[model samples]
Target: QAYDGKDYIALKGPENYLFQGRQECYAFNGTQRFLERYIYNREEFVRFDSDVGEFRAVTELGRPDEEYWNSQKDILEEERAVPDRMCRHNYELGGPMTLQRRVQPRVNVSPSKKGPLQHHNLLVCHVTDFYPGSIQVRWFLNGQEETAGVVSTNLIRNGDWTFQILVMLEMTPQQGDVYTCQVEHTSLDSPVTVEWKAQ
Candidate 1:
């Protein structure tokens, strides 16, 4: 299991800077690890690892921060215990409510607008309205899974708490060829396959 805590701060002045922090915790097989990162100007410059129990400077700009943070005994102790205090605590609270819930995804296969490349056609497989973002989308040509020229979009969150994604396949159609979009998700007992035939 894994959990994340994120913070973002923006400073507007003569010398503007954007600061971001991310804390991540992972637990597996009775072992747990925590990692915290500090990003300045979109660059990660410092990080702390629970296993090390110390802050490290990733860049020269973070050296001062590393020294200051490491000197604070209370802060160091809190960071070290984050995996158990925050990660495990939240996991125990949120897991049963969310992990067991499942919603089936709706799938559609259609021809997309032709690309600038001549003689090649694009097909899109749209999968939407699903709970539990983890999903697998595969493109198949003539009943065999196709690996090349397949593109997928990032999972998008819907306003209604569902997720959506688009997977695309690039190919030159041939007569009698069949293309398939197969989606596998935890919500479905078996994979959902949508077929498109070349005209």
Candidate 2:
């Protein structure tokens, strides 16, 4: 991709995105890896992967085209997460906890559910070589950027070059929707996007 630099971005440029860093290593600068939040209009869901490193391009079995995404491209912004209400999953239990709630929906579009007229989130976990204290999580419904109640973290030193984070996704899973969990590694090539059907 050739660059004019002032008001244009070379979308088809070679993968050599500008490297910006403190120690001679960076994949992108404020200009290169661009992204924006969006709300998808399509009713069905798609998939995508983050390894491509082309600014949030989805890499999955079958994902949406750049046009289908309802986001305005190249607009950088910070998304502060919302507060978690501790909506108990185990409704049968009284005050605090139980396995009933711990048992999550199996990505099956059950028949008795409806919709999350208002948005919600869920908790997701990601394991990476980047270690604890260094991972960030984000949620995307259908194809646009969305936030959860609050982000949570838990770490354990397993062996070497590996760590885990217990990411809370404040989701209200309903029948026709889908949720995607994005796990970001502060030290990796890019984040990975995985999906689950709303139960």
Candidate 3:
């Protein structure tokens, strides 16, 4: 991410985007080295080989416009270098590394049931919108930590630049039984715990 010395903060992930300029660009490496970029609403894609720098360009609609993309060669090269640039800026200008949380984790609790009537119901603790991804979730019952029947899904992308995860505990609800979901993340100095009463 680059703060453009003005109003624009440019961020590059799997896809590249320049917010201040309202342009979008991205690059990736794999079976094919690829990049897709958009400027002023016009989009283009370039696919290249792993060994050679040779590449082919195509417009958003699959039309090959050699002349147009040929002119973008320098821009393509610059975009590829953006990752290093961002790291350099962060190290030099942004100061010491520190945890920053722009979004607070939103927590939700729900009960779900499936299978046999004797089977345990699932108590789901949903955590969303937290940044930096790293998190710890644990389940507790009646002040004691639960050691089994707990399953947690991997963090999922929310698509709005956030993340989510579901931690489930298979439990048999009983009158006045207390269940708790505990979450620990960089966003909090202390762990946040939420409780539910089973009745």
Candidate 4:
């Protein structure tokens, strides 16, 4: 089980800000850990770990806060129990939906561009309507797996609780060349492949 907590803070000075994040994880074997970190203007300033039981400063700006926070026994005790208290509760509440459900992806392949100025060499493979948010998309040329000039977008969440992504392959298309887009997801028993042939 895993959980994340976030906090945003604005300082008195102009444009001064910081972000605090807590990451908690509980393993099935009863082991747990949590990290609380502070980031100031994109740089990590300090962090605290459940195992260490104290705040550690990463930069000069963090020393004061680390010293102050570590002295607060009550706060430290509360944070130490967060993994067992919060993570376990949330994990039990969402376990059934998060761990047991699956939805297969729909795939399609086509040229990246159209019209007179279109470059037919670039192809886009769209994989959508998938659940669980974990998927792998690969490009193949004439039955051989392709690695060079292959790019993929970040997973995007849809309004209906599904996820989507686009993977592109750039190559010089010749007569009789066959390109395939293969997808592997938790929802499918076997990988799905879509083929496109050079004109």
Candidate 5:
């Protein structure tokens, strides 16, 4: 929930190029959100809907593709919008040591009830504190990687230095079966997965 905004730009053709078809150019929060052509059902044979700003063709024909989309409408607005206030004003002018190394890391899940025979169950994955503490936690099932009745916990140190852990697993709920609790840190660059479904 801190995504600044959107942006895109793609142009492909080369990898033994012969053509399946592709080409793109897009953006948002910085305007210019379309300029494409690629089909299998419209990745955009023509698009430019910078939110109600017009132009949509989808499989256009004749008139030389409408004079090449009217000669690229002034080269797509010739660069104008650059909103997002200078990267949110340089992340609010980096104070608080650039905000405690990017914080963000919290997860919790519990399911303890290991016996009454339904094959038993236990699934926990707490993980809190967070921050530069180098972390990684895992567990998955039905999507692979689950090494037996797992159990873990050992980087506890929360006096405010940040870090905490607990990972448990052992299941047998069976219904649609799916269980996951993945985490990888360094303030997240990708890996904060979660899934639980075993009704």
Candidate 6:
């Protein structure tokens, strides 16, 4: 499920610690203190569903701050760290290559026989294969809104070289109930939908 249309240099690890997309940049801003460290300047497409109160990863990037994009102070001070795109050699060998996102309507709702949620009789909607960056999760019982639950993501090394989110669905599934895990991306016309139930 690739939401990206273009490729950019991902400055990560010891190389470019300033800009780690999946870690420092890909969050709700408060937890990572994104606003405090990196000031968000210009942005075009915003991936937020005001109605649902959900957000997605931004599709574009601006200069780290005002000075670099505006002047060469970064080069002079040597504070800027720009990552290189993995596809650079491919372009030199060929040309610009376009990439597309094919989202499979997949949902995995497994029974958890452990901990608080399970003890409190909570049914969790665990979502895997999710696009990293800003995202929100909610529960709907019989097509109605439910309350908050715990959600988490792990930055494991995958072949694609990206982190994946493993969101836990917080509720106990009973008979004759419905749950939906909606994934939103600004570039997509409609959100990626995941639905499941208990037997």
What's each prediction's TM-score? 0.67, 0.34, 0.53, 0.67, 0.30, 0.39
How many residue pairs clash in each candidate at the backbone level? 0, 18, 2, 0, 0, 8
Tens-place lDDT per residue, model 5, 99-164, is 557576888877866557636568888889887777878898888988888877787878876778
Q: In angstroms, how far off is 34's CA in candidate 4? A: 1.3
- lDDT (0 to 1) per candidate: 0.83, 0.38, 0.62, 0.80, 0.61, 0.40
Worst lDDT 10-window in candidate 2: 77-86
Candidate with maximal TM-score:
1
RMSD of 5: 14.7
lDDT of 2 by residue, 1-199 (tens): 1211112222221444332111111123311222222222432122211223222433331144343332533311111100011111112223323221121111211222223642333445444444434555677767777863645555645575445455555666578777676766544456666777764
lDDT of 2: 0.38
Residue 57 Cα positional deviation in candidate 4, in Å, after optimal superposition: 3.3
Q: lDDT rank, highest first? A: 1, 4, 3, 5, 6, 2
Q: Considering TM-score, where higher is better, how would the candidates rank from best to worst?
A: 1, 4, 3, 6, 2, 5
Model 5, position 132: C-alpha lDDT score: 72
Error of 3 at 191 (Å): 1.3
Task: Encode model 6's per-residue lDDT on 1-199: one tens digit a residue.
Answer: 2221222222222443232222112223222111112212443222322222223234444323232322544332222221112122222333223223333223455556676644654444454443333345565667776656645455333456233455565675679777766655433467666666767
Cα lDDT tens digits for candidate 1, 94-168: 675564789899999998876665356789999999989999999999988899999888889987979999999
Candidate 6 deviant stretches above 4 angstroms: 1-106, 113-122, 130-132, 154-159, 172-174
> Which candidate has the top score in lDDT?
1
Q: Give the TM-score of candidate 4.
A: 0.67
